[PDB]
Each structure stands twice: as structure tokens, then as C-alpha cells.
């Protein structure tokens with residue numbers, strides 16, 4: 100599953116035995132109940148540009 | 157950077173400038189508050205490790221605006237497989253003496269998991285490369301941080317369209333118009349995926365920047381994710397330079 104379109108995960112993807120997949124998020128993010136989306140949990144998460152994130156907020 | 161544009165202040169907040177006795181040495185990439193990724197070759201000729209400084213939040217080298225944060229470099233970690241003066245395994249992991257403070261102008265780039273980087277990010281065509289390096293071959297370096305969007309080649313295509321190992325990748329243009337350059341080595345090749353940016357390459361070196369028939373060569377960071385992660389969990393060792401087994 101993870102090799103195709105990232106398993107539908109926004110960030111990281113692990114295959115498990117069966118038709119099973121788990122998405123994961125980097126430190127500073129949490130996984131939403133959709134099981135795919137990652138949302139920041141800190142002010143300055145990695146890989147986001149604050150002046151552009153606040154221009155879109 | 158040849159043929160790019162000024163990175164608007166704060167839009168490349170992971171970029172690091174490395175200085176030796178106040179002089180520009182190389183670039184780097186912040187990946188956490190105490191860890192910077194750069195290129196091994198940047199350190200081949202350092203005599204006194206005490207005079208190495210990393211600067212975060214830099215933009216215009218002509219002025220001080222108060223967003224800069226300088227740190228001493230406590231550890232420079234190089235793979236055992238790197239040979240000075242060459243391209244293969246051209247990566248260094250730098251431990252700062254004290255964390256930087258994250259701000260609107262100082263933010264780490266995400267170091268991706270290996271699988272994600274190999275399965276997903278390796279197929280994103282365009283990525284950004286940045287630095288204060290030469291604006292032209294045999295030209296002056298830049299005073300404001302520059303950035304360039306470059307397309308990545310599969311290695312078979314690089315060899316055709318032009319040694320390139322599994323520890324490298326090519327990206328850029330073969331017409332001499334757009335490239336990274338001397339003074340940019342060690343800086344980031346950053347790749348965007350679904351709203352977040354990731355480290356996929358390090359500006360390395362070859363015979364001459366912006367040369368017709370040749371692409372830029374980047375260290376393939378996906379090969380080193382496990383190596384980097386293990387080192388970031390390790391305690392520091394006396395003596396700045398550390399050669400660490402690879403793999």
C-alpha cells in the first residue's frame with residue numbers, strides 16, 4: 100500500500116501483515132482521525148515556513 | 157547559485173551559513189535545534205575546529221538585523237567511507253554547542269524516513285537548492301540568500317544526458333544557465349510534499365559549476381537517514397571531528 104501514492108498518508112507510511120497500513124507523522128505533528136492527515140502540535144514544526152503559513156491563516 | 161532568485165527573507169528558514177574565522181565556508185541545513193547537515197568536503201582543510209561557526213536566520217550578509225543566531229560547532233561527524241577531496245559519501249552531521257531558538261526565521265527542515273524518501277520524495281520532480289555561493293562560474297558570491305528550483309534526474313538519464321554512485325543524484329540543467337555553485341556546498345536540496353518540506357539532498361561538488369553538458373551532483377540523503385538518526389541519539393565525544401562507521 101505505501102509504495103503507491105504514499106499509502107494515502109500525508110507523511111510516513113508502514114505496511115503491516117494483511118491489507119493493513121498505518122500512517123505516521125513526524126515529531127511536532129499528530130495524526131488526525133482520518134488516519135492519514137498530520138497537523139502541527141507545536142509553534143514551529145519542521146518543514147513549514149512561518150511567514151507563509153501566517154499569510155494563509 | 158547560478159540563475160536563481162533571492163529567497164525572500166524567512167522563506168528558507170532552515171538554511172545555515174558556515175563560517176571559519178568569519179569567512180564563508182559552506183552552507184548547511186538545520187534538521188533539529190542542535191543538528192545541522194552539511195557536506196563532508198567542507199571540512200577537508202580545517203586546522204582549528206574552534207573557529208567554526210554556524211549561523212541561522214541569516215539573509216543579507218551586509219547587515220545585522222537581529223534575526224541571526226550564531227553557534228559554535230561542538231562536533232563534525234563524517235562517514236568512515238568518505239575520502240577527502242572526493243564526491244562519494246559527501247555528508248557531515250554537525251552538533252551545535254547550544255540549541256538555536258526556533259523563530260519565524262529559524263525552523264528545521266524535516267529529515268524524512270527512508271522509505272518515504274525513497275518511495276515518494278525521490279519522484280517529486282522539482283526541489284529547491286539554496287545558498288550564498290557564486291552567482292556565476294568564476295564570479296562573486298551572493299550577499300542575499302539565493303534559491304533555485306531544479307529538476308531531479310534518474311541516474312540512468314543523468315549518464316545519458318551528460319562517477320555517479322547510488323549515494324548521489326543529479327539535478328538541474330545541462331545548458332549552463334542554472335546550477336548550484338561554489339560557496340553553496342553543504343546547503344539543502346529541499347523537496348515539498350503535501351504541504352511540508354523535506355531534506356532530500358546536500359549540494360556536493362564536481363569539476364565546475366554551471367558547465368554545459370553537466371548537471372549538479374547532490375548527496376542522496378535517503379541513504380544516510382539511519383546513520384544520521386543513530387548519531388543524533390548518541391552522546392557527544394571529546395574532539396570536534398568524529399569519523400563514524402558507515403553504514
Ligand SMILES: O=C(NCc1cccc(-n2ncc(C(=O)Nc3ccc4c(c3)C(=O)N=C4)c2O)c1)Nc1ccccc1
Nearest residue numbers: 197198200240241336337338341360361362363364365372
Ligand atoms: O579542498 C578541499 N576541501 C575544502 C573546501 C571547503 C569548502 C568548499 C570547497 N570547495 N572548493 C570548490 C568547490 C566547488 O566547486 N563546489 C561546487 C558546488 C556546487 C557545484 C559544483 C561545485 C559543480 O561542479 N557543480 C555544482 C567547493 O565546494 C572546498 N578538499 C580537497 C581538495 C583536493 C584534495 C583533497 C581535499
Ligand SMILES: [Ca+2]
Nearest residue numbers: 215216219220
Ligand atoms: Ca544579516
Ligand SMILES: [Cl-]
Nearest residue numbers: 205395396397
Ligand atoms: Cl578538537
